[PDB]
Design a protein around this nucleic acid. Structure first.
Ligand SMILES: [Mg+2]
Ligand SMILES: [Mg+2]
Ligand SMILES: [Mg+2]
Ligand SMILES: [Mg+2]
Lengths: 135, 131
RNA sequence: UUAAGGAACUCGGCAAAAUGACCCCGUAACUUCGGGAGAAGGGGUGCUCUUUAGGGUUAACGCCCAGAAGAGCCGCAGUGAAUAGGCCCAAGCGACUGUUUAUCAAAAACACAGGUCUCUGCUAAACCGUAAGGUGAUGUAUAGGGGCUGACGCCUGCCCGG
RNA sequence: GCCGUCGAAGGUGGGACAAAUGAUUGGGGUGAAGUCGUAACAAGGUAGCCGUAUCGGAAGGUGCGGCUGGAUCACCUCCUU
RNA sequence: UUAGCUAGUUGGUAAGGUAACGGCUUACCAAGGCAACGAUGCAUAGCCGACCUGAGAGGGUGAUCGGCCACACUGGAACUGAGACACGGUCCAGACUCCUACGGGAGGCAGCAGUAGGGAAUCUUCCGCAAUGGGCGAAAGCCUGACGGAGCAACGCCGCGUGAGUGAUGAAGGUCUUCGGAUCGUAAAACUCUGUUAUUAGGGAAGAACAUAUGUGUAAGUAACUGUGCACAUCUUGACGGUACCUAAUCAGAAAGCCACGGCUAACUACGUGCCAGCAGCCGCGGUAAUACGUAGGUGGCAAGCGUUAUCCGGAAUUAUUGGGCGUAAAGCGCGCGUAGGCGGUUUUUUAAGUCUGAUGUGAAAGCCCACGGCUCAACCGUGGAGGGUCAUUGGAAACUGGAAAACUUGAGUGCAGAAGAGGAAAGUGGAAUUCCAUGUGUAGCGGUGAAAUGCGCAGAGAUAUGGAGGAACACCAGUGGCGAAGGCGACUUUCUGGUCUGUAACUGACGCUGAUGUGCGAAAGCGUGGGGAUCAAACAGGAUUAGAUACCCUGGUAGUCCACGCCGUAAACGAUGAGUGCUAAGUGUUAGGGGGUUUCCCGCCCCUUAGUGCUGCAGCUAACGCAUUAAGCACUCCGCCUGGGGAGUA
């Protein structure tokens, strides 16, 4: 607005937030801070494999799993793909990405880097779902 | 109370263009007549005629129009206004409207068009665009 | 008086011991802003020598009064003996401080300021008395008597058949 | 060698700050076609709505004032060719 | 949603201390100091040159390279010394690890490597002192995990290629086919060249090498190059590395993939699938014929790289100085008095802080950008340029802002003569009406509803008449009329008393506008204390309707409405439009005034001019409705406010 009314206040903006709100890290041990990490991926131990539904108007049994991470928090993840090589207690890596089936998940694991084994029922997007080249 | 005379002059001017009657009245001042001579030298004005009585004014102007009655400018405004005064160098100055209009400006040596201010390599305190 | 331990005794820390004076630092919650609060906790204190502030009293002398600074001495211990507060947190009951069962109960009871209802138009009502008489009352409904409740502030619901 | 000042660490204590935590508990968001009712949307079937007070299982009702963002019907009066 | 902090604090005196000044530190006198221009306290953090992005203003970060700083297990102190309060030094205390004959002793990789540990994730326990720079020395020379330089990582940037020309048959073969044919397709096969690169063998062992010491002559100085201190000449030095590079020979044989194909987006067909498995960046696909799922074929993009995830900027004009808005879409406080601050009418003279201009210095180097040259080109390296400061110093200009001085009236205020008004506070007076009671009159219903009931009534109601009390409100007038800053103010009269409008113009001569923080007034309800209590009427009771109705309807009915002193301190406090100034078409009524003509007299009619007040309307604006001299138009100043909705005006 008027100029001195902009002088005597710093003209503040509309600061964003995080979209993958993993504490980043946080410093589970030692010397707790916790910030900052900004890691692109994290390992974590999964203590159950399960499945739910979305809200309307979509309907499908989406398969998910709740997981304790390195930083010792508690979050949820939908695993993608046909078949899931996992169970209780199993380690697994994590990315981010939200799906609109519901809240109660805004992440999803990656297939093939660790215990979650690549599914070779694909040939087309083999670069994902953990697949390696067939011949 | 009038915070600013530029507003008085340029606003009676625009309001007079939108209606298109030739003549117009206003209390005088030193800068007003100086720049009015410049506008007469632009071609944006026909003529002026000073007149005097208790105490200032009235700087009387007669405006100008085409035979098809098109307004010779399209636009107008100041720049250097109260609160936020502004200045510009001799090199830094703008060439309004790539060359058509003008940018009135004050100098250490008088009030002039912008062109004479870049040729002379003397800047100063800008007043107003017009175009 | 009693080493070691320190409420294990115990109905219960009953009693006993510990604290205790002066000055200085400092002093939370909560609060009806007054307090709580000496909160708590913690420190110093002896005699000599030196130097200095001083105030009252006087012509002045000196007579009194009670501080500071240093420097030293001693002993385990310097308000050396005696007299002189134990504290913190939390809860119910009661607001107080006060009185009470003289010779077994001192309290959560009684009263208390406040609140409320009802009575009473003046030799007023109530009352003591047989009656005069007198209290109430040198009073005159912002006054007097009776009942119930008990500071504060939030509140004080339904039923008029008996 | 002894003594004195200064001196970190440790010890005693009372408070400030912050985070995790706890029986139960209040409110909120969301989900199965849940049960009860139907306040609002037109005059929403008692016009609504803002403020305040109260009562209610609850939306909400009532009460005092205020606005039309109001309608069946009509403005005192003024404006319009 | 951090507003008071500080006592050696702040100032002085003296001394001491330090390389030096200094509350740096002691003893005394003193109570100052800092803060809305944000002290303090709180969490976060090494900074800068620069890097990324963006057209640009700007936004984000502080890797490598270079400059400054602090640190060396944590913490403290001091010696040596020019310099340290010491990174591979001590002394002390502490934690930790370890040796011990148990008395006691030892140590410190955030140096290079390397190990474990955490983590999504970051390498060889390399060769060498040839070069450059170090340290000692007279020099040779020695030490140099600095450094030269090899090795691992597609981590990134740059570059070459995985062959090229001729080759149709539209071969085989795949897929599809409306079953003719189309498609992969000069693609293959085949023919003809090449061998960048690779396989082999030679040369090169290219440069990076300049050197110091070693002999010759030459000048300064010495009595004496006898010896000394200096420019030419030869001798002699490669870790990398037998490298790079070069030269000849050999074979198209070793050397290609990833994602996506509904749109946004360049890129379509068949099968399976059937609201299932699944995709998803958005919008959304999927329930038997999916171009969106999975499979195939083909195509597009892209390339030894490609996709996803996390982060930053852009697009974002979605903090809007360049570059926004507030009638209704989020958004103008309820309104006022006024401080600090911000802005400021005209003319003249001056000043030179701001401003403009010129110069001197500086703004390290590297980097960015431009020109050039070399590495085969590029990357890269160098050179040189321009470039960059809110920068210091200094000479000039005066229009503008600013400071100082002199003058002016048009803004504002004071006057003088006037006009009006429900403007406010207190007291006083009066009529109707409701009600309560009393009395006279007189009987059987009143009152209420859509229909009823509950209630009042033979104790004679209601109705009717008289007079009495008592509280509250004031019919007509009243009108888009007035007043006031808003909330608000309507019986009348007195006392006190605030502002406004016109005309006037002598009068002072810019005294002004806005207004954070503060201060005060503020509907109705609400609260305290005390008085009053006629109606009206939350809560409540009863009746009725109703499936039910603690709701509408009806009969009663307390607080309360009322007064006074206090308190809260809000609203659809609305025109949902901040204040102030100035300019721009008319018409038409209205309210208080003013000037003039006509009239015998205007009091009547008309024309004009001020101030508020309403309606229709252009220019113009606005998304539209609409506003239109009482602007939502044209602009300036000042203030307040908004940045998706719920969560929530909650905690
Ligand atoms: Mg003990
Ligand atoms: Mg005990
Ligand atoms: Mg009593
Ligand atoms: Mg007017």
């Amino acid at each position: 607005p008027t100029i001195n009314q902009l002088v005597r206040k710093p003209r503040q903006s509309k600061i964003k937030k995080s979209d993958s709100p993993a504490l980043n890290k946080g410093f589970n041990s030692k010397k707790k801070k916790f910030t900052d990490l900004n890691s692109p991926q994290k390992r974590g131990v999964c203590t159950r494999v399960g499945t739910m539904t979305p809200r309307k108007p979509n309907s499908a049994l989406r398969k998910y799993a709740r997981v304790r991470l390195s930083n010792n928090i508690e979050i949820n993840a939908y695993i993608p793909g046909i078949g899931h090589n996992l169970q209780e207690h199993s380690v697994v890596l994590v990315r981010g990405g939200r799906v609109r089936d519901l809240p109660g998940v805004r992440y999803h694991i990656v297939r093939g880097a660790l215990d979650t084994s690549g599914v070779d029922g694909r040939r087309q997007g083999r670069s994902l779902y953990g697949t390696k080249k067939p011949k | 109370t009038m915070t600013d005379p530029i507003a008085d002059m340029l606003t009676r001017v625009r309001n007079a263009n939108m209606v298109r009657h030739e003549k117009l009245e206003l209390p005088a001042s030193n800068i007003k007549k100086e720049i009015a001579e410049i506008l007469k030298s632009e071609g944006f004005i026909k003529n002026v005629e000073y007149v005097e009585d208790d105490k200032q004014g009235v700087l009387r102007l007669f405006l100008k129009y085409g035979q098809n009655d098109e307004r010779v400018i399209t636009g107008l405004k100041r720049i250097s206004k109260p609160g936020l005064r502004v200045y510009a160098k001799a090199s830094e100055m703008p060439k309004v409207l790539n060359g058509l209009g003008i940018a009135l400006v004050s100098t250490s040596e008088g009030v002039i068009t912008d062109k004479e201010a870049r040729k002379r390599n003397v800047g100063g305190e800008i007043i107003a665009y017009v175009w």
